[model samples]
Target chain A: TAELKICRVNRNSGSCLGGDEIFLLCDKVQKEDIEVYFTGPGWEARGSFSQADVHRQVAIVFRTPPYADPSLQAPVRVSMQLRRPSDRELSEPMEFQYLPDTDDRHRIEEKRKRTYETFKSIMKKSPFNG
Target chain B: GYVTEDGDTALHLAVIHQHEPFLDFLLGFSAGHEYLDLQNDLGQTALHLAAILGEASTVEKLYAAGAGVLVAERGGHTALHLACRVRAHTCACVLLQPRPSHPRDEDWRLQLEAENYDGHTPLHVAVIHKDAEMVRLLRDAGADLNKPEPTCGRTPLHLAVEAQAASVLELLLKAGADPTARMYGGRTPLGSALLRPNPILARLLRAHGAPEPEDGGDKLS
Candidate 1:
């Protein structure tokens, strides 16, 4: 039996807004039956590719599908794996990151600060404080 | 059948012309691997030419036919080196991947570490080309990540900085290359980045624990 396995992907991270081209190397698979599936929590999507995108049954050229939340405020970690529709077979998952489209570093920090300040103000006004 | 004025053989010409039928027949009809491995004046075998031309399928066929991956061209560049230089990611993958017939032994190790005349290993070449994918391919295949070239004593990290290859530099650092690796003048990869005033790269280097350089302490020998 040919085991379904993903050997490598050019990069493991891309924009949450999607459409990043990814070159993946893998073991043999039926081009028509194979699907590059991304899943996290309750969200799922498939990489965009035609049957002809598979090369020599060992590699694939596909574009990442948009993440469930394109307006993600921060990076979201997801799992990517090869799935076979024929047998419902799944390869071991690889960790993939869906990065926020805009510059999120300082903004994320500021948001954290705002959240903490809001919580602090509520705590200060609590009637139990009397 | 043999060398032309440029020293290219029938094998070389077949690869050059991309004549798949002729190539198939040549590989099939040949009685020995030596005939298939015949090099031209430039020391390029059919495999080298195929790799340089980014013909992954042809490279695979030649490899399956027993064309040597160890053969180097005039500048001491292996097929893998040439593949890295040209950003032939597919061909580079083909060249560096373990073949089923070959025992993953000394020959494989040599191919991974083989250097060009400039002392640039295939990893170095990939870094210089700013091909992060190819760099990852070579690095994962056991190419020496921190091996310094003889000319500038620069490791892949140093070349990444000198070439201003931000992505490759980050890849190298993330892959655990020596952050403080010293070049000829006791200058570090971080030093190279600082000299070029790449604040972003410098910060990246620092985050990786790269140190500040001192005034003196060159490794002249």
Candidate 2:
């Protein structure tokens, strides 16, 4: 029997509260019996997908599951593995990272701040009397 | 309306925010038309910023409000050049559209082949980005496809090859770009493609009547 294997994933990191859709390319699998597993130190979760989510036996589209703790302050690294329910077989695991929510929020605020500062700078350089 | 240290005007703010009503209010004043052509610290007029931002409708509004199309930014990029640089087809279209408000003189065509400070025409910028659609737009607009950029005396075809843009190269060749066009070093388009070791590209160039690399310099002035 050929062991399951993950070939590629569209993204390697996502928000810890998950639900981010990931497009995964992998070796052939039985559409009706495959699952994606995410495991870390003491936490384990399964990706959410349905049989219809599998494509032509080589690709699967699924959403990441929420981490055990949504309030993580730092990034958490984990292993993403393919599972075959029928044979209890596992694929070589790939590294997927869960990000802290505040990290992205801070980055967005930085961008907004930059835009506003530029707007203010532009206003200061204006010579028109409106 | 005092100018900031960066030399932006209230007109600049209007265009930045894409607020048409504010722009209309500013243009309503007697000096409104004059302010439309005012330059910011970056030498960007409202039209320039509008085109740079891919705001096609705003470009139209600024043009209709009498903004000068020939104005170049600090780097000598006209609004049309920026439109091509950013692949903003509609914005470029608005910049190139013929309107009755202006004179029917050939002055409008000047920007079609206008070179930025680096001597890159809008076509050059398009080909550099490997943007076939933008290249098509400029070509149909009558941009000089075979014109050599001042920096290297390389035509758009030459640039397409240098950028390894097979699709753009095909587009340029089919569009009548001079396959035989040479650069300052006597390097032809085929020579550039062949030297890149792209067999398929070299073969395509040959099919298009591109000459083999010469033994030495082309010996042409």
Candidate 3:
């Protein structure tokens, strides 16, 4: 079984909306059995990618997931790995930044609403209500 | 036309954030209800949101841009219903009043009487809410006082009695609600008022010729 080796990753950072494309550079004809995983610290940080294309064991191209785990709504580093299914050799993790530009604000509002529902008194708190 | 995850567009955000200048700027470049009347993930159009939030200026702005009165939420509540729900009296008045040229003159009247998910038309719902001012504004806007709600056959007059909203009852009566109009179950507005033990409303109904307690429906014939 040929050993699985990854040289590096590119385009490592972006806003939190996830689901953009990224790349992996690797050695020549590394192995026939290879799996790519994009993972991180939290359970939300942990996920794998499919719909990927490998070229002569030199390149792996794939798209990211649309959303990370709920806890990982903030920008966080994701570890990209190339694992050899044959010999079970795993490459060192590479990093990418998730952008939560839109999701973050919505989460804030959800928190506020949850807080508001707990209010014992529901009066008109909006100062500008005409 | 960027939309948030919650399906709020730039227009929706501007109103939610109360950016009046941003609203003016956006409207300067936009036309038609497709933009002005856009609904969010909650099925609330901008006009509905404006009414609920009591953004009176925003309400006027959107309506002037031809925002529709028919855009309802997922639950089938219109902008006027929203104003009632939020108890936004000023907003409710703006919705009831006749506005900018675009529709036929009677379109506003048609809207003033549309039903919500609960099958209560605006006139009946106003009385149910005990919003006497809303009742009067709707009355002035020409909402039908005698129209019975579809399911219960309860008219605005019946609801005013059930709610014991005296001012609203006065408004409805003055607007020509029939004190003798029978419910689907045969009870008149006066009967409902008596059930509430409201002497004043009962007397008012009697003054308008509502059936007496001992007389019931027999007195009519």
List the per-model TM-score of the A chain: 0.77, 0.77, 0.57
> Poorest 10 consecutive residues of model 2 chain B by lDDT?
B212-221
Tell me the tens digit of each residue's lDDT in model 2 across B1-74. 54645566667766666667666666666243577788877788878878877888888877776778889888
Tell me how far the alpha carbon of residue B75 in candidate 3 is from the true structure, in angstroms, after superposition. 2.1
Model 1, residue A96: distance off in Å is 52
In TM-score terms, candidate 2 sits at: 0.61
Query: What are the per-residue Cα lDDT tens digits for candidate 1 across A90-127?
Result: 99999999997742233323433434544334334433
| Alpha carbon deviation, residue B82, candidate 2 (Å) | 0.9
The 10 consecutive residues of candidate 3 chain B with the worst lDDT sum are B212-221
Instruction: State residue A3's C-alpha deviation in candidate 2, in Å.
Output: 51
lDDT of 2: 0.78
The parts of candidate 3 lying over 4 Å away from their true place are A1-130, B101-104, B213-221
Best by TM-score: 2
Off by over 4 Å in 2: A1-130, B30-32, B100-105, B216-221
Query: What's the true lDDT of residue B153 in model 3?
Result: 84
Q: Which consecutive 10 residues in model 3 chain A have the weakest lDDT in total? A: A118-127
Query: lDDT for every model?
Result: 0.77, 0.78, 0.68
DockQ of 3: 0.01
In candidate 1, list every pair of residues with a backbone clash. none
A61-115, model 3: which lDDT tens digit per residue?
6566544543455677776667765776777766666766543235335634544
